[PDB]
Amino acid sequence: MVLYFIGLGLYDERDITVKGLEIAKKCDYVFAEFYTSLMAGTTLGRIQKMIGKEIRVLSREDVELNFENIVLPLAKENDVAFLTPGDPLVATTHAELRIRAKRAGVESYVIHAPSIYSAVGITGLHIYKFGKSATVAYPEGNWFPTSYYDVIKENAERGLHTLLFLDIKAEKRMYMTANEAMELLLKVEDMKKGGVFTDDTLVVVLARAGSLNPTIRAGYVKDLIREDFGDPPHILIVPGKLHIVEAEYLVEIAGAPREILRVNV
Amino acid sequence: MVLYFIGLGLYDERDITVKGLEIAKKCDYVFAEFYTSLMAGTTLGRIQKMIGKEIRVLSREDVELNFENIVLPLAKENDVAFLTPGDPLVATTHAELRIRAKRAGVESYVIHAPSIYSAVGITGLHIYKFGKSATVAYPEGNWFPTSYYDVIKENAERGLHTLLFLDIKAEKRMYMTANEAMELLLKVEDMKKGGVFTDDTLVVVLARAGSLNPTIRAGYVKDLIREDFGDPPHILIVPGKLHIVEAEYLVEIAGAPREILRVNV
Numbered sequence: 001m002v003l004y005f006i007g008l009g010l011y012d013e014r015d016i017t018v019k020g021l022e023i024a025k026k027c028d029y030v031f032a033e034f035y036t037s038l039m040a041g042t043t044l045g046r047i048q049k050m051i052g053k054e055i056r057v058l059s060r061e062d063v064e065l066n067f068e069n070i071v072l073p074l075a076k077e078n079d080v081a082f083l084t085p086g087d088p089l090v091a092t093t094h095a096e097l098r099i100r101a102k103r104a105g106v107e108s109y110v111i112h113a114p115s116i117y118s119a120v121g122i123t124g125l126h127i128y129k130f131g132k133s134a135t136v137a138y139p140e141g142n143w144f145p146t147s148y149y150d151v152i153k154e155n156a157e158r159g160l161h162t163l164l165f166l167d168i169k170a171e172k173r174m175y176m177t178a179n180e181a182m183e184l185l186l187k188v189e190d191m192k193k194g195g196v197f198t199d200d201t202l203v204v205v206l207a208r209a210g211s212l213n214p215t216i217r218a219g220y221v222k223d224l225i226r227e228d229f230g231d232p233p234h235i236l237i238v239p240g241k242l243h244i245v246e247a248e249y250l251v252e253i254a255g256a257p258r259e260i261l262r263v264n265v
Numbered sequence: 266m267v268l269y270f271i272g273l274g275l276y277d278e279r280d281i282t283v284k285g286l287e288i289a290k291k292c293d294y295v296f297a298e299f300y301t302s303l304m305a306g307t308t309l310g311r312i313q314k315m316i317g318k319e320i321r322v323l324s325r326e327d328v329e330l331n332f333e334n335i336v337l338p339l340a341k342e343n344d345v346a347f348l349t350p351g352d353p354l355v356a357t358t359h360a361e362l363r364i365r366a367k368r369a370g371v372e373s374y375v376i377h378a379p380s381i382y383s384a385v386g387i388t389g390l391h392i393y394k395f396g397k398s399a400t401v402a403y404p405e406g407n408w409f410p411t412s413y414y415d416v417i418k419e420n421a422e423r424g425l426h427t428l429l430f431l432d433i434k435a436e437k438r439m440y441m442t443a444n445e446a447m448e449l450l451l452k453v454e455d456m457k458k459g460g461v462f463t464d465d466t467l468v469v470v471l472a473r474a475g476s477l478n479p480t481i482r483a484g485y486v487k488d489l490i491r492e493d494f495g496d497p498p499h500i501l502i503v504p505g506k507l508h509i510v511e512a513e514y515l516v517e518i519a520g521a522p523r524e525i526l527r528v529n530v
């Protein structure tokens with residue numbers, strides 16, 4: 001009679017919380033989706049071994065179109081767990097799944113776990129200073145989307161940081177790299193010329209947040225666009241004007257050039 | 266000789282990630298602070314019992330003024346852990362402690378945990394639509410803080426949601442409720458008269474996130490300002506322009522008045 005939304009965390013199978021692991025172990029059925037994101041630091045096998053339960057993977061369609069035909073029926077007479085990378089209900093469409101549960105007379109509880117939204121604090125940037133968030137998407141055929149550019153503009157002009165998720169084709173495990181994101185933004189800057197993203201723009205790259213050895217780099221596009229940040233996933237951030245303390249952290253921890261202490265503060 | 270910043274999570278001892286627990290168990294010395302937030306679901310005991318070590322709790326003073334005198338010295342020849350509520354680097358100034366660690370020649374690692382910052386997802390409001398965040402601070406003597414009122418105005422003008430962290434004075438066992446925050450806001454609205462926060466403003470209250478039964482309520486200030494949301498911690502959210510599915514979740518899951526289902530686009 002109960003459905004548990006459980007977050008798996010940031011990077012590997014140990015990123016789940018003690019609460020989520022113990023509850024998952026007690027569940028009769030366990031589902032998981034890896035289309036909204038991927039636990040790049042682990043495997044389904046390791047997650048399964050860690051929980052000691054068979055895990056049925058669901059596709060985007062399984063969830064969005066048939067959640068009530070696949071997951072909810074079993075929840076009416078058993079304890080069911082639905083695992084997702086990061087923190088549950090962060091992905092835009094997941095919150096409404098709880099409405100579906102209610103409509104089916106199924107009670108649901110949420111078990112939180114680390115999310116990149118909060119994990120980016122490791123970059124040293126003050127969390128309250130983040131503005132609207134966006135996703136950098138690959139252009140396709142005749143479609144060249146650019147809203148993520150306007151988002152950066154709207155945030156920066158108010159002294160706010162912009163968290164940029166990079167395009168992912170999880171089914172094919174194809175990651176957009178920070179380098180590609182920068183190249184794309186420079187291209188968008190070249191058509192719109194709003195003085196938002198240039199070679200002089202300061203940016204921060206966060207790779208493999210959650211692992212014990214993440215890659216935290218800060219600097220100007222002209223020096224980072226060709227730098228190697230390692231394996232995905234990559235997260236890009238275009239900071240607004242920095243507080244001296246933020247800049248000192250980027251310099252001491254993220255290897256940013258001393259120049260930011262006078263140019264971006 | 267390493268220092269670990271480990272988050273304990275939102276509500277109780279089980280909100281710590283498995284990664285954090287396994288590392289905490291193998292540390293020689295364990296420190297912690299409980300002034301940056303309130304974990305109303307646990308005690309130090311369960312944490313110590315869970316970790317198997319004795320934990321020395323530090324005051325804001327011990328940390329902000331003597332961290333390099335109390336903690337760092339030990340990390341020079343031992344593996345030390347510093348525990349904090351939620352995620353250690355979210356809405357705290359703990360990130361600066363990593364700089365001190367560096368300057369003292371001590372390597373530090375960050376182990377994330379579920380944070381109130383990403384838990385807002387359980388309110389049904391799209392997390393990417395959150396703009397700048399702010400804190401409703403206790404007025405002290407003649408000093409009456411108000412900047413948080415401007416943040417709401419700025420976000421609302423852009424149709425973005427506003428996350429309002431609530432003040433806390435751990436040494437005085439004072440934890441600001443969503444009610445107290447609403448009163449302070451009406452007072453600020455009374456003197457600024459910007460039509461930003463009134464009896465007709467729609468707000469959302471999230472109390473004790475992380476617990477299995479958090480209080481999630483949405484409605485007009487006039488109706489919620491006198492409502493009992495249970496024990497702290499509490500956060501207050503002032504939504505911006507609502508998407509249809511956000512409104513439906515608020516109504517179906519947070520008990521908001523059906524009339525908010527009607528969105529004026």
Ligand SMILES: Nc1ncnc2c1ncn2[C@@H]1O[C@H](CSCC[C@H](N)C(=O)O)[C@@H](O)[C@H]1O
Binds near residue numbers: 355432
């Ligand atoms: N479980 C919870 N429920 C509601 N509000 C919470 C909360 N945990 C923290 N807060 C809010 O945030 C304030 C502490 S700010 C420190 C936040 C912490 N590092 C984190 O990652 O969550 C509290 O005064 C309260 O307003």
